[PDB]
Design a protein around this ligand. Sequence first.
Ligand SMILES: Nc1nc2c(ncn2[C@H]2CC[C@@H](COP(=O)(O)OP(=O)(O)OP(=O)(O)O)O2)c(=O)[nH]1
Ligand SMILES: Nc1nc2c(ncn2[C@H]2CC[C@@H](COP(=O)(O)OP(=O)(O)OP(=O)(O)O)O2)c(=O)[nH]1
Ligand SMILES: Nc1nc2c(ncn2[C@H]2CC[C@@H](COP(=O)(O)OP(=O)(O)OP(=O)(O)O)O2)c(=O)[nH]1
Ligand SMILES: Nc1nc2c(ncn2[C@H]2CC[C@@H](COP(=O)(O)OP(=O)(O)OP(=O)(O)O)O2)c(=O)[nH]1
Ligand SMILES: Nc1nc2c(ncn2[C@H]2CC[C@@H](COP(=O)(O)OP(=O)(O)OP(=O)(O)O)O2)c(=O)[nH]1
Ligand SMILES: Nc1nc2c(ncn2[C@H]2CC[C@@H](COP(=O)(O)OP(=O)(O)OP(=O)(O)O)O2)c(=O)[nH]1
Ligand SMILES: Nc1nc2c(ncn2[C@H]2CC[C@@H](COP(=O)(O)OP(=O)(O)OP(=O)(O)O)O2)c(=O)[nH]1
Ligand SMILES: Nc1nc2c(ncn2[C@H]2CC[C@@H](COP(=O)(O)OP(=O)(O)OP(=O)(O)O)O2)c(=O)[nH]1
Ligand SMILES: [Fe+3]
Ligand SMILES: [Fe+3]
Ligand SMILES: [Fe+3]
Ligand SMILES: [Fe+3]
Ligand SMILES: [Mg+2]
Ligand SMILES: [Mg+2]
Ligand SMILES: [Mg+2]
Ligand SMILES: [Mg+2]
Lengths: 435, 439, 435, 439
Amino acid sequence: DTMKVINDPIHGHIELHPLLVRIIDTPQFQRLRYIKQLGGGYYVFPGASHNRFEHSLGVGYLAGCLVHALGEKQPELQISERDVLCVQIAGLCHDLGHGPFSHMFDGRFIPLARPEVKWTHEQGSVMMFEHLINSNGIKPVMEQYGLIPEEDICFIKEQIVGPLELWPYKGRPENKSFLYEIVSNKRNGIDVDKWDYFARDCHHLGIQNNFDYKRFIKFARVCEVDNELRICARDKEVGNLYDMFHTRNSLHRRAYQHKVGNIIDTMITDAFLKADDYIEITGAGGKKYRISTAIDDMEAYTKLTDNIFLEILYSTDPKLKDAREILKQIEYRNLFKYVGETQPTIKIKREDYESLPKEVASAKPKVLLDVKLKAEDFIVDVINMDHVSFYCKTAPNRAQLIRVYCKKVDRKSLYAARQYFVQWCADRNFTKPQD
Amino acid sequence: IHVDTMKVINDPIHGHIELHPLLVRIIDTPQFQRLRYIKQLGGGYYVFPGASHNRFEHSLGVGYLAGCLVHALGEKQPELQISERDVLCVQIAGLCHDLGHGPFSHMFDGRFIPLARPEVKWTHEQGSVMMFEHLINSNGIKPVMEQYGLIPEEDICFIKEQIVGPLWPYKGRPENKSFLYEIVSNKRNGIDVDKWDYFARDCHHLGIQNNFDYKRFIKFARVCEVDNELRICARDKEVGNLYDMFHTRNSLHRRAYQHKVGNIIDTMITDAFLKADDYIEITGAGGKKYRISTAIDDMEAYTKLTDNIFLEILYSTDPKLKDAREILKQIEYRNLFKYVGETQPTGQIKIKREDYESLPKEVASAKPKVLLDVKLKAEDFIVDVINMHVSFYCKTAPNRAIREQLIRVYCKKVDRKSLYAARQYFVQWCADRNFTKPQ
Amino acid sequence: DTMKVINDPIHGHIELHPLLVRIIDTPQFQRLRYIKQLGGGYYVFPGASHNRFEHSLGVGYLAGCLVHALGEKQPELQISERDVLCVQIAGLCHDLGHGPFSHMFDGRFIPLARPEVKWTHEQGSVMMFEHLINSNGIKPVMEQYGLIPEEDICFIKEQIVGPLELWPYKGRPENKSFLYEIVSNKRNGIDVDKWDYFARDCHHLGIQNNFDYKRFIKFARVCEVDNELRICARDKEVGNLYDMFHTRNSLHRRAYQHKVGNIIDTMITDAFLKADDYIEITGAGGKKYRISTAIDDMEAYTKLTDNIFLEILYSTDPKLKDAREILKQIEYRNLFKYVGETQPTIKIKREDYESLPKEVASAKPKVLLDVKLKAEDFIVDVINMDHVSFYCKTAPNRAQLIRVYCKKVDRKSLYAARQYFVQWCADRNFTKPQD
Amino acid sequence: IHVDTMKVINDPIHGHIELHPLLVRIIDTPQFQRLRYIKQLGGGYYVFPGASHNRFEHSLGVGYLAGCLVHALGEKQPELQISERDVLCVQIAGLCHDLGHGPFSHMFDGRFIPLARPEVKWTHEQGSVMMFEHLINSNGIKPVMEQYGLIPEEDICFIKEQIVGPLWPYKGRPENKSFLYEIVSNKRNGIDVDKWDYFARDCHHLGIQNNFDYKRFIKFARVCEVDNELRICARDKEVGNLYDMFHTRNSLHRRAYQHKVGNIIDTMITDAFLKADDYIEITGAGGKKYRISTAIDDMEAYTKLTDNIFLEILYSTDPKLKDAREILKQIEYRNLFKYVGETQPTGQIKIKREDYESLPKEVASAKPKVLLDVKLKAEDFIVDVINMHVSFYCKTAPNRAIREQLIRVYCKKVDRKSLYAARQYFVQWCADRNFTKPQ
Ligand SMILES: Nc1nc2c(ncn2[C@H]2CC[C@@H](COP(=O)(O)OP(=O)(O)OP(=O)(O)O)O2)c(=O)[nH]1
Ligand SMILES: Nc1nc2c(ncn2[C@H]2CC[C@@H](COP(=O)(O)OP(=O)(O)OP(=O)(O)O)O2)c(=O)[nH]1
Ligand SMILES: Nc1nc2c(ncn2[C@H]2CC[C@@H](COP(=O)(O)OP(=O)(O)OP(=O)(O)O)O2)c(=O)[nH]1
Ligand SMILES: Nc1nc2c(ncn2[C@H]2CC[C@@H](COP(=O)(O)OP(=O)(O)OP(=O)(O)O)O2)c(=O)[nH]1
Ligand SMILES: Nc1nc2c(ncn2[C@H]2CC[C@@H](COP(=O)(O)OP(=O)(O)OP(=O)(O)O)O2)c(=O)[nH]1
Ligand SMILES: Nc1nc2c(ncn2[C@H]2CC[C@@H](COP(=O)(O)OP(=O)(O)OP(=O)(O)O)O2)c(=O)[nH]1
Ligand SMILES: Nc1nc2c(ncn2[C@H]2CC[C@@H](COP(=O)(O)OP(=O)(O)OP(=O)(O)O)O2)c(=O)[nH]1
Ligand SMILES: Nc1nc2c(ncn2[C@H]2CC[C@@H](COP(=O)(O)OP(=O)(O)OP(=O)(O)O)O2)c(=O)[nH]1
Ligand SMILES: [Fe+3]
Ligand SMILES: [Fe+3]
Ligand SMILES: [Fe+3]
Ligand SMILES: [Fe+3]
Ligand SMILES: [Mg+2]
Ligand SMILES: [Mg+2]
Ligand SMILES: [Mg+2]
Ligand SMILES: [Mg+2]
């Protein structure tokens, strides 16, 4: 009641502990106001204007409510006041590392710009979180409220990215193992992160959200399973869960995998690439970095947001003329044309993403072709497709898609790109159809 | 353009919105797509995290609602002579009404420009007229208008009049279809599709409920003769719906638009724009260079003027921008101007746009009752100016008619000493410029 | 988690303590399934089919959530596990005493049938609650879970009806005074009872419900005010409260005061009256009671529900022919015709309700009348119209309508009833208009 | 009946519903108003307290949706020759489709009547036809039909066919408007306004969300030629909406309609009706006396047969009703039949309506592997029978076509000894009548 309250459209009023407020009001956190949640989705769904910032607030809030709910119903667990804060901090900072247009950056751009590099936004989040506390002297404030930084910061990072190095976690002992299933749950993909963006994306997409997370948390319990401590749902809650997965399927099919949405995101990527050489971002020690290299220094990365889209678009510099023209095509709605899609029966690896258009253009279609295509005329889009145990009332504590687009939009040539593609699919024997 | 073959855009408020190809042609332009880059509530976003929405989706909504209103009237009252041409012209009017808005919306024409160019009289509504002209000229929309049966010389004027008013005063349409001018912007009773959309839209993002059901209201809407003039009438039963709209508007103004911290942030951003104006160049027509404040004079530069300017100052390295850049960071670090108080000129004269620049000086020159260990210059004061009839029909007689200013003060110095000093400069200034004694 | 869960459309899942379940599964509680919430409103609003039963569950649930929320945030209050149950029981049973078509019964019918009698449904609730525990042996079960019946039952009754006899309450001491503001709050009309039926009636009427009760309870605090302990709202919650009152105004104006709705309810009352003599309900000791007398014996009253409407309607008995014809008029939608409405500047007392039609018909309108009316041709409907202190963040713990309808529906005579009415209003100088 | 002068009824699902005077005349009858007194989900109410809604409001909804569908088609596809007369006939069909339902809805025709009169083949759909005939005859609706341009002999048949099917098989309308028969009741693909309404309605009261947007689906609905037959087609883009409807139906069947306790209660009430049938008299035509089970033979008695019969047994003093009355109290006291188990005849033959009476006897006659200290008669067993293609069009080619049984067992004796005894009678009976081994 001495805390901060932020009014939220999804969760209503979210009360924020002073320590969380201190972290949020920094350049490194406020940065997330400037990155669209659904990336290019906005250019298909006008309601999807929401950014990573409000999402981060949501996951942190939900993070806090889960730990708190469990601890009261099971004092056995030895959940400390310190633990609750640490889970909340993990929730708030889990997406700190996302780049321009979110999943476009680490999912396509960086692979294309630096196939060499193994990079995900989660490690960005770890790196950016470390940068945040040092730049703003959060560690004293952490100590002030009863947290021990050496132990807890490790815990915080582990909740986001997983084990940093029989029991892999250095930040917390096995007896509070259930904490690591809260913010990021790899072991079935059930956690508060996704609960939030479901409700959140649905709200902004005008899609009904099916899963009642308030209820699920209320009935949530910690049970022993295979002599490991983990979070378990009431038997009656299965219907709720059937339903969460159905909301998920709807979001992935209608929104995240949208044909035009993904095209636009690849156009933006193509634009970033022809601008990469000429754009300068100032990092630590006044050093100069490019878009693709900005991930190497967290000072520079902080200033890398959706802003780069407009900065390229508004630029007069003729070095950027090539990049600028693509973005202008988006405005005029002259977009890459959709050729087709296929799935492999093994999956394409991201270090292979760069190599793919050459392969597509270099195939030899059986049928004679009226016009021939270079590799520069193809865009190939790699779209990656993504148990639970229960407890009973009467007895508690017992249990890839690949698209190809063509840059040329005349009818005759569009039919050329067609045949290169059908051949390419067949000859790396990915599936043969469709019509 | 045969029905059912249109483009459909899915919207969280209105559901699926159908777009005539001509509307689509206007939408798919740099001048239109620009609104994707301007936040609806401006600095409001920094208080309400759900209020991330931009002018773009709002404008689409008003265009859609515009269409639903005239179409509904035309179908149930054929005497009115509502043409498909009229329908399109009303939709285009709805769609482009906010084209002229600048960075952070109302912050721009409502505060910045008055502060930057006090002699100039400028509103975003006339911006919208200018930008619409630039849009149709740059992209050759006029042939397409003719293509679908519109007469550009006559209709473009109609479109502009529906937005900003008369340039019988209206040249764009005859008096016999006068009721059309009550759809997009209704000056008399303030009930129109513009208000309807942003009421519902802002509510959605603010997590505020909307009690006005516009779908219903349009269904029962009628045009009747009033004082020998044609006007839009609501069924008597719809009064309850109207009670709800005004309560929604009252809540939004009091809870959201007049929010203290929201407005503080809006003034800080304005303060930042001012000390940056000299050093920032935007390229206009003929390659000419303009500044933020002069960009409204040339639509070519203005097209490239959006919320982007906030981040540009922010990300800037130039030490000329050191004064501005540091202020924006205070926003990031959440070290903001502190709220001293509020007062109203009740029964008195209202501050004029030509006097905004002059206001902080007057405040700083006051004579505080007890003298303070701290004395404050004019540069440390901020003064914020916040600015605050239906005819019916009954069923049995379907065509017969029936029937503030706030000023706040913030201080740039929030050290304990200056703050209570800042208190009495304000209280004294209020006493001596005839405002209510603050509380 | 060993409790019962009932799924509710307004509140979601409501968990019920075993003791509450024991009380609910009795003829005396289950009775409320058979009484419509809005009475004659259903015949205007097809969505308002809901009954007192589900409403009672709601108020009990909300009752429990308020006490529980306060006790955790202020352990100072000395709220016992026993107290929480007692507030919940009060919530669940507060409407036990309502009769057929709810407010029609005690608000019009009983006054007309027995003007002599001073009767409200709240005392019914007290009487019916007492009858419930004795008939079903609840007192042992009460003792079983740690309740002391002599002390607590008094507390329970006091929360519903007020003081039974400086400090008026015998059931609880002044230091837990705040408990009496939860289920029924006379001292500003702010309590959980109304919170529920707002949300509930709104849901079924298709009216938006403005008040967020979940939030209000979350921020609710107990403060000292005028050296009496009472419940206080956060300063920020004023906007929420402005809003509760606006929802209230909407419900009263659009629904509860509906012109046709009230007419129908008076028609039903008129029907009950001409049936009252001939209908037999079996009470204690096999004794026979009538509709108006059924309130005297709780055994008989238990079997008095909306059922009486259909029993009259379906009857063959010619003694009931007079009553039956009125009900049949409702089906054919031949209803009392609306003459007009007025308010007094002093209010009509319910012991005077019976006397009113005689007065209306006996006036002498200045203008000459073409047809004259008996008292039997008039229906006069009496519709009764219905501070808060706060606390701050930084410093906790510091602060009648009267309608006249006419039974005859020809144009000439309808205009007669008109003039009797205008005269009657003027000559007991209630307001003169309207047009 | 000029538009905008109709009667409007406010509905929680559809908002305001407009009613043509002819529809109103039908609605304001004892035969129609009767549905106010029959619970939609029957015994479901005793598990879901929010499910208090009755057949009345549901029927109004289907009538409204019926109107929205044909009207939408008629406006966007004038070739189809949809008349205002057709519109009314479809609305009346929608409105009266559930007239024939009895006490607790599906409990009556789905369980009771099979148990009470096993030789008789009866569904509420044919009830609806009978009751509609009784309605129009008793209240002289036929002149009013003629009054608004309807031809009673031709149209009343059409109305009946839209409900129960053929009495080209349809005499009520020619093959050229065949698509009309897919609106109220669609037998082939089960997508119609009936399902749409009660999906949305039940969801509202159960606190279950509805993912099918019917407002949208109707907007984009089209009639196309399919196999040289006229049928209703959805736009290809609407597939996602359809994914949502079926998931809603799947949830409702699994979560609500097939609820264990709900169904148990439905069988107890049925059990109560049976032992009361002999002693209860309902007055039919010519003053003749009928019982509950025979009331379906005469519409005069049936009009007075509603959920009221539940309370009548309950409130009854007659000791003849002692057997029934005590059962209902077990419901009040919540002492219910206990659930033994469930099994399915997967890949096997389905229980026939003529065999329901015979089923408990077969169960009781089984030979349990170990003999029990408790032995059970047939009167102590209850067996419950629970019973569980779209063409599209694409925008660029607007008129070209594209493309279980459960049986449960409950026991009336729930003493610990009888219950585990009851267990193996069931498991053995299942083994020896070829059902799945229970789990
Ligand atoms: N044209 C256009 N569509 C938008 C916009 N915002 C959202 N959308 C939605 C509407 C349709 C969807 C895809 O439209 P596109 O023009 O990109 O692609 P398309 O609809 O397949 O093109 P086409 O109609 O020629 O087949 O995106 C916008 O600003 N302009
Ligand atoms: N268009 C596009 N969408 C992607 C890509 N990769 C993932 N997505 C979408 C699909 C579902 C969604 C998954 O979101 P997450 O569960 O990872 O949650 P998040 O908030 O977005 O990120 P995080 O995991 O760090 O919390 O992201 C991509 O490469 N391109
Ligand atoms: N501090 C902070 N507040 C935010 C943020 N986003 C939205 N808000 C809303 C929630 C509360 C509201 C308070 O604004 P302030 O930070 O200026 O706090 P304050 O008004 O000066 O003081 P107080 O602590 O009493 O609220 O702003 C954010 O990122 N940081
Ligand atoms: N705090 C604050 N609120 C403002 C200011 N100017 C306007 N508002 C409020 C009043 C109504 C609300 C929305 O403005 P409008 O009603 O004019 O609607 P609009 O769509 O935003 O602009 P337009 O009139 O051009 O259509 O914003 C301002 O300067 N400060
Ligand atoms: N006629 C009728 N109206 C209903 C029914 N259910 C709800 N309503 C609503 C619709 C209108 C409202 C009042 O209708 P009434 O016929 O009782 O009174 P009225 O509408 O003022 O009559 P009138 O139209 O002649 O002025 O009640 C119903 O079953 N029949
Ligand atoms: N038609 C009609 N409505 C009435 C009458 N008296 C009261 N009402 C309505 C107006 C508002 C509503 C008030 O409900 P309450 O606050 O009393 O709550 P309740 O659940 O209905 O009863 P209780 O007070 O016992 O809890 O009842 C009446 O005499 N006639
Ligand atoms: N006991 C009871 N349950 C109700 C009532 N109203 C709705 N329900 C729902 C909520 C839970 C569900 C359980 O029904 P039962 O009472 O038969 O309980 P049960 O299924 O036999 O056993 P269990 O305690 O495990 O749920 O019924 C009610 O008034 N009393
Ligand atoms: N548990 C249970 N559910 C049933 C039974 N019969 C039907 N149901 C379910 C299946 C669908 C659901 C609603 O029935 P319908 O789809 O037939 O729609 P309706 O409006 O109720 O009746 P109608 O077909 O006459 O329009 O009720 C039954 O006997 N037992
Ligand atoms: Fe996330
Ligand atoms: Fe606007
Ligand atoms: Fe109540
Ligand atoms: Fe139906
Ligand atoms: Mg504050
Ligand atoms: Mg498309
Ligand atoms: Mg159960
Ligand atoms: Mg009316």
